With several copies, the nearest count.
Chain A
């Protein structure tokens, strides 16, 4: 009977942090979490050192060492970390479907835009940062107009090599 965090919303929300939207194709890949803390749901991941592991640290990704994919919302995750994949757990990375993610940009994004990754934190945006600290995920595009700090769905394809931007 818990009425806390009641906002009396006009209508239903759109999605959650890492939920997918149904479509026939999806590469979902099982990896093992390597970071000491968990990994959030809609997040980018790099290639681990365990030959099948992944890390949440993408500060050193390059066109030669591209990022691995994006985690998905699992909803059965050990109930000790709130919404995360705990250490030593199947990660369920996705690299082909359409997924809801979080926007980090001042002016927001619109339907068809490039997707730029900020290597410092691992956040998605519309344009390059400008100090050799951003990559462009070459095969990727948005699918929703959204403001700053809101959820937008994007279409992703990680087999296309990334592009470095200074």
Chain B
């Protein structure tokens, strides 16, 4: 699935948090609300953007 209009450059923290939790919530709802995600693999550049 595509993100919710997020580029993560010129994007405020609310968009970042919404985009991140979108994946976890989507995976949970795809398994009919029975299992959550344990690990997230992001590209290194985006991990830097978040950590800075």
User: Which residues in A have some Cβ–Cβ distance to B below 8 Å?
Assistant: 8
Range of interface residues on B (Cβ < 8 Å): under 10
The number of residue pairs between A and B whose CB atoms lie closer than 8 Å in the complex comes to 3
CB nearest to B32 among chain A residues:
A8
CB nearest to B33 among chain A residues:
A8
Q: Which residues of B contact A8 (CB under 8 A)?
A: 31-32, 34
Q: Which residues of A contact B32 (CB under 8 A)?
A: 8
* Closest 3 pairs (CB-CB, A-B): A8-B32, A8-B31, A8-B34
CB-CB contacts below 8 Å: B22-49 with A: 31-32, 34
* Chain A residues touching B, majority SS: loop
Q: Which residues of A contact B31 (CB under 8 A)?
A: 8
CB nearest to A7 among chain B residues:
B32
Q: Can you offer 3 A-B residue contacts whose CB atoms are under 8 A?
A: A8-B31, A8-B32, A8-B34
CB nearest to B35 among chain A residues:
A8
B36 to chain A, nearest CB (A): 14
CB nearest to A6 among chain B residues:
B31
Q: Which residues of A contact B34 (CB under 8 A)?
A: 8
CB nearest to B30 among chain A residues:
A8
B37 to chain A, nearest CB (A): 16
